Amino acid sequence: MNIFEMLRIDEGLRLKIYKDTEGYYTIGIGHLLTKSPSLNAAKSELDKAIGRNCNGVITKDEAEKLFNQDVDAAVRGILRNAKLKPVYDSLDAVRRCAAINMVFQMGETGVAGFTNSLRMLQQKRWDEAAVNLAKSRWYNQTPNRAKRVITTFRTGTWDAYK
Numbered sequence: 324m325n326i327f328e329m330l331r332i333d334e335g336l337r338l339k340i341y342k343d344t345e346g347y348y349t350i351g352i353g354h355l356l357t358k359s360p361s362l363n364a365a366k367s368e369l370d371k372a373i374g375r376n377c378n379g380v381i382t383k384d385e386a387e388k389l390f391n392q393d394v395d396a397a398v399r400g401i402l403r404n405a406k407l408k409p410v411y412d413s414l415d416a417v418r419r420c421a422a423i424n425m426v427f428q429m430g431e432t433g434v435a436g437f438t439n440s441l442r443m444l445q446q447k448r449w450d451e452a453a454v455n456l457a458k459s460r461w462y463n464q465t466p467n468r469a470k471r472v473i474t475t476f477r478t479g480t481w482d483a484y485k
């Protein structure tokens with residue numbers, strides 16, 4: 324297992340514009356297009372991202388290239404963030420994947436409310452961090468996804484994905 328396989332499981336793959344769990348226009352492997360309610364705005368964002376007139380549909384190769392860019396952007400966001408980088412650098416490789424997964428889903432600033440969890444993770448207090456992570460809108464709105472990610476933080480294994 325690696326971060327790409329983990330996120331492909333969590334996000335799936337769709338080649339036409341769809342709505343995510345919050346109602347936002349998305350394509351590919353969880354690539355957010357826009358938070359605007361306008362499908363025309365979403366189609367414009369798609370064409371800009373792919374570099375051709377897509378009319379709302381992409382190829383598998385295009386979806387995979389967008390996905391590589393999005394994972395790269397999540398990692399770079401962690402590494403540039405003064406609050407996230409020291410925690411990330413303290414983690415083993417499996418738990419680092421759980422961190423990238425959260426940033427991919429919620430953004431560098433969407434994890435801003437997890438200050439107490441970050442401290443517990445840096446101290447390697449895994450059970451306490453797991454309980455704190457579950458006291459969140461994230462867990463209550465996407466519980467199966469959150470349980471898999473939390474279990475990965477708690478155990479440092481891939482057991483939730485196997």
Ligand SMILES: Cc1cccc(I)c1
Nearest residue numbers: 407410411422425434
């Ligand atoms: C809990 C969490 C989420 C995103 C990134 C890190 I480092 C830790």
Ligand SMILES: [Cl-]
Nearest residue numbers: 465466467468
């Ligand atoms: Cl879920």
